[PDB]
């Protein structure tokens, strides 16, 4: 009840009801259950839900939005209009705006953008005028982000996050107590831990030695556990590497006996890593390691971690480059890319606010990639430079690629929501 690891495929599914205006448990609805191989309808619902979660959220912030069918209908020029829709590039350079009621040709040639990383498939609030079946946009913006407190105020204490509890953990004065008492609680995040590289192993030793006098609550080691996924034989190389890691962890009894280890797999690791959510590394691959290090769990990607009253979502993906390669335009340089980036993820309330061809997702399981309600800590382990930002009450960090960031990693003290950094390059 104090520390739970929730896999993507165990995330409680909720369906929004536009009528009762509430989120209902899957079995409490007439909505078909999810399967890996979905139906054409499922593929459509994927984006409908993405639109619906934003619509519902946006309708409460309050401006008068117009649907697209409303515009496509009109026989006259609609001077002013703000529409919530998804940007799609049907033809190169030709952009359109889509919503449940229809699609409309977009003219963004004179549009201005608020901060954020605007990409193909992002939902936006487009303000402008309409005439002759074309929507001329003056300004693009993102639907306003709704903080946890607000979501909780409207919907109650539904446990959207998942885990043992049947009610939100942010409403447990008991866990709040424990959370504030355990000031030494600490989570260490690393990414691209290439176990096949000698230097990576040497730096993990230094980390274990340095943490022995005060072993962290948990080490979250993120994916791409091999610097070389070409291989003389991939699966066995990974199994061998884990043997070495287990040996090193066992050589530091203080860490071995106190610290929990969580392994979040990357897109290049064995398994179906290129479609999300992806399952954990195969048990045949990890059995041996788990026998020597019983306090470990190999989870999905993304995955959710619940610690006392705090929600932590972890996602390993080279997301920033995907977003950049699919941008409508470059954001203004008066704000750093990670700040634009985080605004996007939270405003979209989704980890992969991109097209399926860019971020393949099992249609029926898209809801598992949601970032709403906003969590306490969002970890996007990316090969992109490390960073720590704070948007809408949510701490968002990226420890970066361990082997390529001078062996940098991030530390999170839950007691007072503080984030710290370390770098072992010089050793």
């Amino acid at each position: 009840h104090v520390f739970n690891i929730i896999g993507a495929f165990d995330i409680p599914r909720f369906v929004y009801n536009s009528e009762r205006k509430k989120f209902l448990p899957l079995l409490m609805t007439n909505h078909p259950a999810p399967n890996l191989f979905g139906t054409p309808r499922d593929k459509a619902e994927m984006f409908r839900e993405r639109y619906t979660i934003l619509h519902q959220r946006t309708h409460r912030h309050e401006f008068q939005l117009k649907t697209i069918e409303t515009l496509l209908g009109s026989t006259t020029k609609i001077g002013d209009a703000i529409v919530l829709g998804m940007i799609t590039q049907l033809k190169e350079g030709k952009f359109f705006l889509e919503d449940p009621t229809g699609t409309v040709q977009l003219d963004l040639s004179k549009a201005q953008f608020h901060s954020g990383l605007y990409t193909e498939a992002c939902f936006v609030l487009a303000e402008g005028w309409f005439e002759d079946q074309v929507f001329h946009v003056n300004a693009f913006g993102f639907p306003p982000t709704e903080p946890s407190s607000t979501t909780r105020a409207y919907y109650g204490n539904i446990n959207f996050f998942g885990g043992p509890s049947n009610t939100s953990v942010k409403t447990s004065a008991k866990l709040k107590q424990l959370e504030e008492e355990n000031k030494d609680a600490m989570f260490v995040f690393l990414s691209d831990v290439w176990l096949d590289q000698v230097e990576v192993l040497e730096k993990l030793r230094i980390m274990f030695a340095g943490y022995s006098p005060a072993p962290p609550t948990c080490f979250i080691l993120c994916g791409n556990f091999s610097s070389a996924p070409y291989g003389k034989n991939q699966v066995q190389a990974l199994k061998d590497s884990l043997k070495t890691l287990a040996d090193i962890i066992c050589e530091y009894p203080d860490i071995h006996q106190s610290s929990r280890f969580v392994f979040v797999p990357g897109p290049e690791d064995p398994g179906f890593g290129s479609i999300l959510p992806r399952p954990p590394l195969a048990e045949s691959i990890t059995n041996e390691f788990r026998q020597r290090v019983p306090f470990s769990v190999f989870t999905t990607n993304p995955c959710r971690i619940q610690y006392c009253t705090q929600e932590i979502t972890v996602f390993r993906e080279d997301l920033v480059n995907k977003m950049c390669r699919n941008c409508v335009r470059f954001p203004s340089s008066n704000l750093a890319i990670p700040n634009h980036f985080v605004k996007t993820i939270l405003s979209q309330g989704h980890l992969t606010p991109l097209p399926l061809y860019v971020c393949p997702v099992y249609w029926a399981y898209d809801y598992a990639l949601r970032v709403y309600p906003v969590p306490d800590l969002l970890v996007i382990a990316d090969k992109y430079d490390p960073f720590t930002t704070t948007n809408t009450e949510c701490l968002c960090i990226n420890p970066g690629s361990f082997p390529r960031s001078g062996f940098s990693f991030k530390v999170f003290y839950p007691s007072n929501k503080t984030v710290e950094d370390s770098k072992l390059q010089g050793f």
Binding site: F9, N35, L36, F37, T39, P40, R41, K43, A44, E45, M46, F47, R48, Y51, M86, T88, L90, F96, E98, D99, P100, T103, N233, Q234, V235, Q236, G271, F272, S274, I275, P279, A282, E283, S284, L356, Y357, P360, V361, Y362, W363
Partner: protein, 125 residues
């Protein structure tokens, strides 16, 4: 039968497609030299074949049953007609693929491929 396009013999570099159902001896020998193909390699290639096909399925085009028009948007549940969109890559055909692959695994001691297959099945009641 089931063929793997151009498998390479690590011993002599001889390249040729390999029919897994027709070229067994439980092993697969190179045609040129008679070195046995690394089962481990075959297993992994089969796995990748499942991935590539699982990917093809996830990104497949959708067609209208009334007009043969490919879906060009994301949200519409129906077509400009009132026609329904249908899979261009079928679930049934994928399952069959899994049956074949599941057999080869059962017969050649490919525990890893069995695992992936099993998961692939468990997530589709």
């Amino acid at each position: 039968s089931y063929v793997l396009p151009e498998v390479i013999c690590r011993s002599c570099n001889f390249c040729r497609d390999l029919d897994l159902c027709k070229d067994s001896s439980p092993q697969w020998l190179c045609s040129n030299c008679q070195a046995p193909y690394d089962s481990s390699a075959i297993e992994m290639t089969l796995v990748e074949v499942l991935q590539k096909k699982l990917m093809a399925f996830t990104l497949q085009d959708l067609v209208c049953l009334k007009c043969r028009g490919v879906k060009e948007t994301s949200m519409p549940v129906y077509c400009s007609c009132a026609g329904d969109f249908a899979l261009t890559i079928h679930t049934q055909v994928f399952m069959e693929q899994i049956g074949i692959f599941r057999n080869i695994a059962q017969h050649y001691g490919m525990s890893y491929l069995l695992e992936t297959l099993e998961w692939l099945l468990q997530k589709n009641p």
